């Protein structure tokens, strides 16, 4: 289930005409390009070494698109100010997500095009890639405007065409690195909790991709147990743990299991004194 996304952001700045604009491209949830308007002279830059096999023409063409998007978001922010009847002395945020999911048979599985204003759903292209879901009264103005102009056809063309073709290009060009996994390294720690009770904490460290499943079992039955959100280690890998409160002396009846696509075999761990 390969994917490509572009996550874009414009933040207006009170007293300045130009918002800050930032675009980030992803393949399979990993950053591979980024554009930032606040840079010295802004360009799309490669965020993964395999992208450096793209030539000057590619970077120049992508950068000109960003310059376009930057203007597009500026006008849109000003329009939104009108629709919501807001004041110009504040900061406001416009975000966009777009891109595609590709199956193993190279069929487009889903196309995405979504906007948010002030961190709330504004308008989105439906799964049919033909019609719009507007989330509030203001967004209906945009919907009408975009239905009038046939905007959806433009995005459909991109999603069904360039998005899937270029993602395949990238998969081909970056295959080895794009398919690389890191296995989780797991261990169990033991902590006092209260009288008669202790905490077992099952750790998974150093894994990639971020997707993972941690489970606790009593005898051989699964449980429900504190589970932290998966978090970046800062070195390209991820961490997670799952803990359970168990009665003193029953620690050996509890077993942790770790499931990750990077492992050659699911892990089964117990607390080891």
């Amino acid at each position: 289930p390969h994917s490509m996304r572009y996550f874009e952001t414009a933040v207006s700045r009170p007293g300045l005409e130009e918002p800050r604009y930032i675009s980030v491209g992803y393949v399979d949830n990993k950053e591979f390009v980024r554009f930032d308007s606040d840079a010295e002279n802004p360009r799309y830059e490669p965020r993964a070494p395999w992208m450096e096999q793209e030539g000057p023409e590619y970077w120049e063409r992508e950068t000109q698109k960003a310059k376009g998007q930057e203007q597009w978001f500026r006008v849109s922010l000003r329009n939104l100010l009108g629709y919501y009847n807001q004041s110009a002395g504040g900061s406001h945020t416009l975000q966009q997500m777009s891109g595609c999911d590709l199956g193993s048979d190279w069929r487009l599985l889903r196309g995405y095009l979504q906007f948010a204003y002030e961190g709330r759903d504004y308008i989105a292209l439906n799964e049919d890639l033909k019609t719009w879901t507007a989330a509030d009264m203001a967004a209906q103005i945009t919907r009408r405007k975009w239905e009038q102009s046939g905007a959806a056809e433009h995005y459909k063309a991109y999603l069904e065409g360039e998005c899937v073709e270029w993602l395949h290009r990238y998969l081909k060009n970056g295959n080895a690195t794009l398919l690389r996994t890191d296995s989780p390294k797991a261990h169990v720690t033991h902590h006092p909790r209260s009288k008669g009770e202790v905490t077992l904490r099952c750790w998974a460290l150093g894994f990639y991709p971020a997707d993972i499943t941690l489970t606790w079992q009593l005898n051989g039955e699964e449980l429900t147990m504190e589970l932290v959100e998966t978090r970046p280690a800062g070195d390209g890998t991820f961490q997670k743990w799952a803990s359970v409160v168990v009665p003193l002396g029953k620690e050996q009846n509890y077993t942790c299991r770790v499931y990750h696509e990077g492992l050659p075999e699911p892990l089964t761990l117990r607390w080891e004194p």
Partner: peptide, 9 residues
């Protein structure tokens, strides 16, 4: 391959 948006909001 970045997207180019059509008409503004």
């Amino acid at each position: 391959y970045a997207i180019e948006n059509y008409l503004e909001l």
